[PDB]
Design a protein around this ligand. Structure first.
Ligand SMILES: [Cu+2]
Length: 235
């Protein structure tokens, strides 16, 4: 159970984004129904009043929390991957529009899941703003908790992979458009009962064998990190 509090741009906190520039759902419960319209941007997808200004190449940092800012972030049970997708804002997230900018699943070097490192990073993970056409975008940050993913939700609705999905409104101002955004995947649609990485038993299957759900990271993506960029405690 986790939510986005806000974003940082180049290590500068943009402030509380909840229901302001984040299309915040009413609570931190996961989406689990892979065919749900809730897979797009969680249960309360609507235009919120503010879009955060960035330029291509900026570091954009998502900041997650559990109950209060800079707390335990997410229950340590919730091992799994983190991804970030981008879609033009006019799509409202509908259709074949979601392009993956970031994937981090299980790090063999470190022996840790992305979520383990997200807790260490005080809820912070970052992407480099890609060189797409200037305009309004949705940045869909997605944590999959796999602690109950041995079952399909479709076979047992009390279990299944848990999607923590947050859509941030980001306006890209300065961009040379060196990597124009292609068509992407639909949410719901991209993940099905047969997709690799949706059904996974962390109790019996080694994390070293985990394959995160496609699609692959787009060739236009410039990278990211799971690391604390800003100290909320200094504010
Ligand atoms: Cu939870």
């Amino acid at each position: 159970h986790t939510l986005v509090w806000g974003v940082w741009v180049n290590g500068v906190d943009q402030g509380d984004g909840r229901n302001i520039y984040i299309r915040s759902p009413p609570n931190n419960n996961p989406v689990k129904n892979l065919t749900s319209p809730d897979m797009t941007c969680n249960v309360d997808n609507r235009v919120v009043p503010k879009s955060v200004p960035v330029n291509a190449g900026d570091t954009l940092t998502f900041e997650w929390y559990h109950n209060t800012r800079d707390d335990d972030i997410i229950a340590s049970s919730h091992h799994g991957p983190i991804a970030v997708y981008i879609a033009p804002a006019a799509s409202n997230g509908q259709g074949n529009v979601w392009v993956k900018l970031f994937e981090d699943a299980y790090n063999v070097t470190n022996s840790t899941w992305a979520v383990d490192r997200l807790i260490t990073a005080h809820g912070q993970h970052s992407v480099v703003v890609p060189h797409v056409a200037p305009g309004d975008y949705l940045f869909r940050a997605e944590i999959i908790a796999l602690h109950e993913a041995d079952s399909l939700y479709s076979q047992n609705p009390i279990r299944g992979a848990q999607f923590y999905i947050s859509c941030a409104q980001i306006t890209i101002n300065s961009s040379d458009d060196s990597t124009p955004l292609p068509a992407g995947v639909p949410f719901p649609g991209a993940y099905t009962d047969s997709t690799p990485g949706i059904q996974f038993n962390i109790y019996t299957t080694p994390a070293t064998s985990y394959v995160a759900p496609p699609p692959s990271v787009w060739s236009g993506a410039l990278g990211g990190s799971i690391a604390q960029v800003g100290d909320a405690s200094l504010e």
